[PDB]
Symmetry: D3
Subunit: 169 residues, 6 copies
């Protein structure tokens, strides 16, 4: 069994993240999806809690027909020591074989620990990114179009737009 | 949507835990399953990591035909302040309505925070419990019979029996 | 018994803070006063320890004829998870009914937890603020005029001016 | 100004603690009263939160004719390093001169740091201990007689008896 | 360059520890010596601080003619997650090849991370151990005979005997 | 015995640091050398782990004819409370008499705790700084000339240049 790993803040989970996930699932048996910076919530850049993001991913991956047997969703708090972060991930996850990341630090930390590291198979443009999603939430743009409908439903239930607007005042 | 919550160490996940989960799913729409004491591993009482237990639950719940849309699996480290533990759970989980626990502390902490609390719908006997599973792993008893086959496969992959035997020497 | 809560760094406690406190005491029976960022000391923005600020508040509130039965003074360290901060405050304080804050994050965190939140009854201008107090301490301005005399006496005893001047070299 | 320091769990604050405090106030100008093991709540031995104990002390000291100018009340969480605990206390408190404790560890830690240390001036009777108070709360004995009435009122408001009884099931 | 690693509380450093270290230096180029449980001090089982033990080791290894080029002395605080402890050690130490330990948990943690692990080359009897050293310090036995003289000198300077006797009252 | 203390990030240890250390050793019997910000690694400003820097210092001091009896090397992680940092250092170090630092915060923290504080006896040339060393590692300049050869050997073994280059992409 070949297991990949992906790590991102996913503030919130959007269609781009999902496109990337589906591409990775073409080349691994199972994908471990880590929600990074799980300690951060209630800011403009990081509005949603770990739990809210777990909810987003769980609903979206189940809405899009990906069998439950092919993924794991794990929240991962940041830690002060970069030299321990890979060990931290490892403790919180199933065993894995390959890490997907475009980030130089994430790449180098995993490489130094002996893991195979590769760039994600797809890169999405800025206008589909979290920055754009959050800006549209703030400015009454079309944020819903950038998310799976299951994520929209989460954001509606948790009053996510109201939160981010209040925090920006 | 009515969401229940359950919390246990699940060292390891066994058939009893699963029986209880299925009973709860008769009376809630979705169940949030928290893996408690997620910081504890590599002892006789707590042999498996957070990640290994996430793997166990993920594989078992998917093996037994429970749709992914009906549950969430979340590791929860213990914390030094009992008065903060419910807040800690809340941050790490989707919103929920009702807590299932037989434990007086867990009950009282959740009750004081305004949640509905009830006992689990089923109680399994000691001979099906984690204590018995771990004893059988140590003593070459029939531990496999007490677990879903998907969990057995996890324990085989992570060399769980070898670990617990070494730790007991 | 109707209890309010206020939270601020109070670096140091000045006449503006006191004016606000007295206005709040017109509309609550008791006021819980939390010294925020209690972990921060010995910087230009945050010169004084938690203990020094406890001393400042204790002396000032006693000097100004407010009965001891009407307030509580509690140091509160910041924490990494915004989603837990209200729980953290709750553990450290008596039960309370209403929060007074002008800060959007503090407001939203408390409102999400179900508390009534309102702006402070008074807003003081910048020239009476901590920034101005600290600048005057550094530049040999009239910092004493901005503080209750009881706070001046604390600052003299702990060599606060000497400290901030050394730190700014 | 001569300042004493006292530290205790005060689970809960009882008439004994108050007798000792009054006795110390005959020998010092001001007393810093620290609530130790502030992180512990919701157990049989340590039922009450830091905030609940702050409330108990604040009410009791104000309702017994001790002027506010003569004391400070500070919650102090335990920490893993004994060699840092005096530094921890110091950060959280006004400057002080003398420590009152009968505990050999507390005495030695403070003595090593250069503080004068002395035993409490009074040893209260066996009836006034926290063990007895908590037993009576559990067994429907006369716990109220062992406490200042202001502390009784706190225990009523926070449902302290109901908590301890539930926890003991 | 072949580097070994050893880890122990060394409360205090005694002749037995030194005998073992010298035996290990027969089979490695350099030895990384970690002072475990570096957070623990001022108890009967763990009387000495991390710094005091660093001093003990530094002086003893220098007194006994072992060249400085052949060892490293590193204090290592315990951590709550066993699954991260090897990563923690790795961050704090030079790169190493082999671990020497008789402890089943230490062995298994390092073996799971891919290190070669072996028992120490020598086992000393109980009458030469830390337990015996500390008992003799308490009971006015011949503790000095169990230590290198350089360690005795550290213990005299830090008033170690006085400390342990006070703590035992 | 007169013991000095020095603290620095030493990212990496260079000929300047060694010049200063030798200069201090003219004025004290023994020098405690603390590696500050020990938690920081794998960034452009702080590339090396605590362990890698311990290795650098251990090798450099042993390869320059300083007797082992004259120094101690101790990693010190930063902590959130400035008011505890001196206590933190003290716990981790042998007893000391005098602190050498040009940093206003370090000076004031130690001075407040009653230590003698003095500036380092030498200020090394601009060429020997860590900023320059790291720039040269990145830009294929002559970084080796700025370091003791023993430190070069450490940087080669740990692939320090490859790390810093990858991190800068
Ligand atoms: N010491 C530690 O604790 C430590 C060390 C290393 C990393 N980490 C954590 O690891 C997590 C991941 O690190 P990261 O640097 O990747 O952070 P990140 O914030 O999750 O991602 C960085 C940026 O890349 C974007 N992105 C990701 N995949 C993309 C793709 N396939 N195509 C286009 N854009 C893409 C993200 O876009 P969106 O805005 O659309 O999401 C984001 O803007 C973080 O939570 C970080 O804190 C922690
Ligand atoms: N401050 C804090 O951090 C804090 C506060 C409260 C609770 N917690 C955590 O919350 C988690 C859960 O607490 P817990 O007391 O329930 O611990 P637990 O160790 O998960 O469960 C206690 C015992 O009950 C058994 N059990 C559970 N459900 C049962 C059922 N339906 N029928 C029969 N036996 C059953 C378990 O059996 P098995 O051996 O078969 O699993 C175990 O022996 C723990 O990880 C605990 O540490 C943390
Ligand atoms: N995750 C967490 O730990 C967390 C989350 C939320 C908040 N907090 C903490 O909560 C504390 C309070 O938050 P805060 O944002 O209010 O910080 P703050 O540092 O206390 O100050 C807010 C700003 O508003 C000013 N101010 C306050 N009341 C005023 C009034 N009535 N009129 C005019 N100006 C007024 C203060 O002035 P002065 O300079 O005169 O004081 C300061 O400049 C902080 O310590 C923060 O760190 C922590
Ligand atoms: N590293 C650390 O974090 C660290 C290090 C040292 C100490 N501490 C903390 O410091 C606190 C102080 O320790 P402690 O053991 O004294 O706390 P404690 O829980 O108050 O224990 C003292 C015991 O003696 C009793 N007592 C105290 N003063 C008395 C008097 N004058 N007459 C008669 N009986 C008296 C108390 O009775 P009652 O039951 O009636 O109260 C209690 O049973 C603890 O919270 C401890 O954890 C922490
Ligand atoms: N999660 C974590 O933080 C974690 C995980 C694993 C281990 N650790 C730490 O790692 C450290 C070392 O673990 P440990 O179990 O070896 O603890 P330890 O306290 O150093 O002692 C192990 C026992 O074996 C004895 N001993 C050691 N070497 C011996 C020899 N060659 N012959 C005879 N007796 C010998 C020691 O005797 P003496 O009394 O003479 O010293 C002690 O009684 C501890 O500080 C532990 O806390 C931490
Ligand atoms: N609360 C806390 O945790 C706390 C509080 C206070 C301090 N600290 C820690 O203490 C450490 C010490 O602070 P620091 O700013 O001095 O560290 P630092 O990173 O070594 O900064 C000193 C700067 O001055 C240079 N320098 C030092 N001594 C010199 C000399 N004799 N001649 C010429 N240049 C010299 C260094 O050069 P190079 O680049 O060549 O090294 C560096 O650029 C830090 O790690 C800090 O975080 C922590």
């Amino acid at each position: 069994t070949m297991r990949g790993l992906l790590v991102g803040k996913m503030q919130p989970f959007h269609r781009g993240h999902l496109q990337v996930i589906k591409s990775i699932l073409e080349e691994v048996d199972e994908l471990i999806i880590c929600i990074g910076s799980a300690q951060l919530s209630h800011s403009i850049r990081d509005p949603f809690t770990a739990g809210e993001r777990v909810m987003m991913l769980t609903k979206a991956l189940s809405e899009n027909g990906i069998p439950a047997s092919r993924y794991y969703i794990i929240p991962v708090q940041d830690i002060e020591c970069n030299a321990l972060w890979v060990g931290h991930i490892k403790m919180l996850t199933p065993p894995f074989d390959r890490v997907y990341s475009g980030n130089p630090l994430v790449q180098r930390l995993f490489s130094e620990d002996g893991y195979e590291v590769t760039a994600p198979p797809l890169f999405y443009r800025d206008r589909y990114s979290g920055t754009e999603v959050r800006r549209r939430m703030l400015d009454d743009g079309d944020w819903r179009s950038l998310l799976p409908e299951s994520v929209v439903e989460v954001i509606d239930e948790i009053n996510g737009v109201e939160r981010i607007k209040h925090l920006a005042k």
